[PDB]
Amino acid sequence: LYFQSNAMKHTIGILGGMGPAATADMLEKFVELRHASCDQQHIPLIVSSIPDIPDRTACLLSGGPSPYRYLERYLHMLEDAGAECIVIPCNTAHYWFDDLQNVAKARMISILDATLGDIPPSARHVGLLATNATLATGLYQKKALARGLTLIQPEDAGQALVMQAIYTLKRGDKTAAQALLLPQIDSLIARGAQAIIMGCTEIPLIVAGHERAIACPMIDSTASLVRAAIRWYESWPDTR
Amino acid sequence: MKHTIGILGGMGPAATADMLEKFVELRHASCDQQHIPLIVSSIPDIPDRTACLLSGGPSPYRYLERYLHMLEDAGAECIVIPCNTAHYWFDDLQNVAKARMISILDATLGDIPPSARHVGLLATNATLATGLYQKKALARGLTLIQPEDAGQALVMQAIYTLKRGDKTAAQALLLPQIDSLIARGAQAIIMGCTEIPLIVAGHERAIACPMIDSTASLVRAAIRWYESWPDT
Ligand SMILES: [Cl-]
Ligand SMILES: [Cl-]
Ligand SMILES: [Cl-]
Numbered sequence: 001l002y003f004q005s006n007a008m009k010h011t012i013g014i015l016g017g018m019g020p021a022a023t024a025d026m027l028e029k030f031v032e033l034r035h036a037s038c039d040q041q042h043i044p045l046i047v048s049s050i051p052d053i054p055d056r057t058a059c060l061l062s063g064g065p066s067p068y069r070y071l072e073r074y075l076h077m078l079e080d081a082g083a084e085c086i087v088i089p090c091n092t093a094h095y096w097f098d099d100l101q102n103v104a105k106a107r108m109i110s111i112l113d114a115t116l117g118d119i120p121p122s123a124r125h126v127g128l129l130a131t132n133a134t135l136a137t138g139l140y141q142k143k144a145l146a147r148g149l150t151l152i153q154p155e156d157a158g159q160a161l162v163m164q165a166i167y168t169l170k171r172g173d174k175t176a177a178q179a180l181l182l183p184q185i186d187s188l189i190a191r192g193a194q195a196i197i198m199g200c201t202e203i204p205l206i207v208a209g210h211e212r213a214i215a216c217p218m219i220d221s222t223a224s225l226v227r228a229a230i231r232w233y234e235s236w237p238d239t240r
Numbered sequence: 241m242k243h244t245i246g247i248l249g250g251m252g253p254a255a256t257a258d259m260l261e262k263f264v265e266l267r268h269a270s271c272d273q274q275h276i277p278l279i280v281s282s283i284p285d286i287p288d289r290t291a292c293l294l295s296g297g298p299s300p301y302r303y304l305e306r307y308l309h310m311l312e313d314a315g316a317e318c319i320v321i322p323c324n325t326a327h328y329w330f331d332d333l334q335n336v337a338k339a340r341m342i343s344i345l346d347a348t349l350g351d352i353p354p355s356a357r358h359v360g361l362l363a364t365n366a367t368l369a370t371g372l373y374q375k376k377a378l379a380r381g382l383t384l385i386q387p388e389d390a391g392q393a394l395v396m397q398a399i400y401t402l403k404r405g406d407k408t409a410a411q412a413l414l415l416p417q418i419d420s421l422i423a424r425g426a427q428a429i430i431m432g433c434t435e436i437p438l439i440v441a442g443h444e445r446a447i448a449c450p451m452i453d454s455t456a457s458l459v460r461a462a463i464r465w466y467e468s469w470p471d472t
Contacts, residue, residue: 006283017272019271019272019275020260020263020272020278024257024263024264025261027256027280028254028257030253030257031253038288039251039286039288039403040284040287041284044284045250045280046279046280046281049260049280050244050277050278051272051274051275055271055272055273077279077315081313082310167271170271171270172264172269
């Protein structure tokens with residue numbers, strides 16, 4: 001008879017598709033990170049995985065077509081579907097975060113803030129694995145400075161390989177991607193990184209299974225955003 | 241006109257995340273932008289399907305109907321359901337749906353090798369009890385082998401252990417049941433509950449016979465539908 005609307009349900013939209021693998025990984029983490037006795041106790045989620053959004057690095061570094069209009073469209077799709085909170089499992093796309101937040105009715109939670117908060121306070125010197133555009137536009141720079149953090153970026157030659165790893169994953173070869181990425185991780189560690197931000201939502205997929213062999217904590221930006229979204233969801237009177 | 245696929249999910253949420261992964265894995269794409277457009281409803285509050293069917297619990301239908309329309313209104317032109325048990329309501333939804341719907345049952349039977357006549361079935365009690373696969377298998381010339389009652393209780397227990405979050409526990413329960421089916425002559429085993437592939441993951445090669453993944457079967461069928469238009 002009576003159905004509770006998704007808005008009243010505190011439904012969370014995921015504005016994804018950058019890329020699709022990263023979005024599927026976030027969904028997987030919403031299940032893992034939420035305490036639930038059964039199906040019915042899991043978080044209500046609506047997902048946009050609509051990958052036609054233009055490449056973020058091409059736009060930012062090369063003046064390629066901007067993703068922004070697509071972001072706005074699918075954000076509105078989610079809102080109309082009942083999302084009361086929106087999360088974007090793409091670091092690079094947070095270039096547009098403030099712009100989107102201007103047009104959003106829903107609450108929006110930054111992957112950047114969530115990720116930084118999940119770094120141990122004691123880690124002062126922190127590696128950053130991210131797309132070229134995320135580094136170039138300094139998305140993490142401002143915030144890291146506020147927390148008194150020193151980011152260690154790979155050198156130009158290394159970053160080229162990190163970028164290659166990211167796109168090999170986006171292209172669907174994890175094994176190859178790993179072969180590319182692992183040495184760069186060791187380089188950052190060799191350079192004194194006390195932790196490494198996985199600052200591209202493809203990186204956790206590449207690292208998965210090898211973390212136990214990595215000599216410092218990896219901070220997972222996707223997981224960080226999920227945890228932050230769960231906390232939002234669970235702060236409601238009908239949630240707790 | 242983008243041929244967007246809606247996923248009416250959330251039963252349960254792990255099976256839905258699993259379907260998304262397979263969409264990525266099963267679609268040839270040179271880059272993000274060549275992957276399938278997907279809108280996903282994972283809104284798990286849908287009432288337990290088995291409890292309704294077997295135990296007289298609340299009916300999931302009006303929920304399914306609601307999220308169906310939600311997906312259509314977001315622009316999904318084709319809808320898929322990564323729950324076998326939910327297909328008790330498939331025809332009903334299909335009758336209210338403007339978007340195209342693709343049945344997990346047909347897709348899954350279609351992916352069984354022709355040479356496999358005697359096929360094991362791992363599924364929920366409601367899926368077995370309501371005979372979702374039986375009339376369809378019969379028409380194809382298939383003979384379904386299901387676990388004996390004691391074994392089925394353990395299968396059901398494995399499924400709910402996975403939904404509850406322990407994969408390791410679920411495996412300990414499920415694995416012997418798979419071995420039992422093989423001992424009884426199964427030429428292939430349908431994983432007929434969408435949590436099964438998740439439990440079986442990593443042990444597949446350790447299993448003698450082929451396992452037919454209902455989730456994967458649905459994704460492939462959806463991809464085919466997507467790639468079937470003049471502009472795609
Ligand atoms: Cl990213
Ligand atoms: Cl790509
Ligand atoms: Cl199922």
